[PDB]
């Protein structure tokens, strides 16, 4: 296969160029709505928290995959381990509103509290990188899914449902220092 490289058009040459044969492929595991739908921990936990999907670690599966798309949209599911009652407020409620029971308040059960939250932001799609400011780095204050408050949150896990991603961005892997390739332990039967 030969082409004009500077045209930047895609070229996908297969094996049949030299006698081979392309086989069937099944790409379920690299689907967006599937690969993004699993719980990931949030390591910024406080008495009060603003659920922002950009607090996920920039190297975990869901986190680092989310940082590889410019725009995204998804409903949420949270798992909180708290002491006391858990109060939630949507995107835009004053902070004081986190202190009343009229808002969605879950009374604690023994193990933990597992809730499902809808997408409440006013923007049609959120963003992971924002070029500019919003006052008359950091994203604007309106890129979040609400806020939760309890006496003390111990663990918070988030899950993106119905994920939709737009406009991909560079995604990196761990650099190899001096080796010819990266070498690490792989699970192997004992003895």
């Amino acid at each position: 296969t030969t082409s004009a490289g500077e045209s930047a058009d895609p070229v996908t040459t297969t094996v049949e160029n030299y006698g081979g044969e392309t086989q069937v492929q099944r790409r379920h595991h690299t689907d967006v709505g599937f690969i993004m739908d699993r719980f990931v921990k949030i390591n910024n936990t406080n008495p009060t928290h603003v659920i922002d999907l950009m607090q996920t670690h920039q190297h975990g599966l869901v986190g680092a995959l989310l940082r590889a798309a410019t725009y995204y949209f998804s409903d949420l599911e949270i798992v909180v381990r708290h002491e006391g009652n858990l109060t939630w407020v949507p995107n835009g409620a004053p902070e004081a509103a986190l202190s009343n029971a009229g808002n969605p308040t879950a009374y604690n059960k023994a193990p933990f509290t597992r809730l499902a939250l809808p997408y409440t932001a006013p923007h049609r799609v959120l963003a992971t990188v924002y070029n500019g400011t919003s006052k008359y780095t950091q994203l604007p204050a309106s890129f979040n899914f609400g806020a939760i408050r309890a006496t003390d949150i111990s663990e918070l896990l988030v899950r993106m449902k119905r994920a939709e991603l737009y406009c991909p961005r560079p995604l990196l892997a761990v650099e190899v220092t001096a080796q010819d390739r990266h070498k690490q332990k792989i699970i192997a039967p004992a003895k």
Binding site: G5, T12, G20, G60, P118, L172, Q184
Partner: protein, 221 residues
């Protein structure tokens, strides 16, 4: 009389990838419209197929320069999505989060020389089983190889095949064992005419039947 049940043991605990859904608390929310929003992708491998990305040769340059020597081995890298030359590509960026792979991997070579310089290159796929990779085209010509000249069309696409015993192969070099389970690839330079400094840019992308299988996340936090 009421329905008797048996609360089983071992069931119910939270599995962070369970396939069931929670209980709602807040209903009747309508989203703003996003019909026909531009630039959506639904499968990572489509993005990896449509957008090639550069490799990382010595000193972190994506190009190999024509060499004046009697040794005409431009470069050599393992066929492993963890290799050192592929450490910056998007393809490896995805594959680091998956356990096994299968399929062909495309390499795109683009010449960047001036109009008054010519060259003729050759790429060969050396499968595993040889102790020392070949160092000259007369010897590596027996593998599966391809040759190309430089002219009007400046690009060339070579499909590194998937030839291995097990139908799927790992995406991480196991241990201090050497001699990668999948063979190397050697890009040679047959000859050149009046191309002293002009380069060759190399990029890599997915194939028509590439596939990643099992999701993990090995990156330490």
């Amino acid at each position: 009389g009421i329905v008797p049940v048996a609360c089983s043991d071992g069931y119910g605990g939270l599995v962070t990838t369970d396939p069931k859904t929670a209980d709602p608390v807040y209903g009747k929310v309508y989203n703003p419209p996003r019909t026909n929003y531009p630039g959506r992708f639904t499968n990572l491998l489509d993005v990896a197929e449509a957008c090639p990305t550069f490799l990382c040769f010595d000193d972190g340059k994506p190009y190999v320069v024509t060499r004046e020597d009697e040794q005409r081995l431009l470069a050599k890298f393992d066929v492993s999505l963890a290799a050192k030359h592929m450490s910056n590509t998007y393809l490896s960026g995805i594959a680091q989060y998956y356990a096994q792979y299968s399929g062909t991997i495309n390499l795109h070579f683009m010449f960047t020389g001036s109009t008054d310089s010519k060259a003729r290159y050759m790429v060969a796929y050396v499968p595993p089983g040889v102790e020392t990779p070949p160092d000259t085209p007369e010897r590596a010509a027996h593998c599966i190889h391809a040759e190309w000249d430089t002219g009007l069309n400046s690009k060339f696409t070579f499909s590194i095949p998937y030839v291995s015993a097990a139908d799927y192969a790992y995406t991480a070099s196991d241990v201090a064992e050497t001699t990668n389970v999948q063979g190397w690839v050697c890009i040679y330079q047959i000859t050149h005419g009046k191309a002293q400094n002009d380069t060759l840019v190399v990029s890599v992308s997915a194939g028509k039947d590439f596939e990643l299988r099992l999701p993990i996340d090995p990156r330490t936090q």
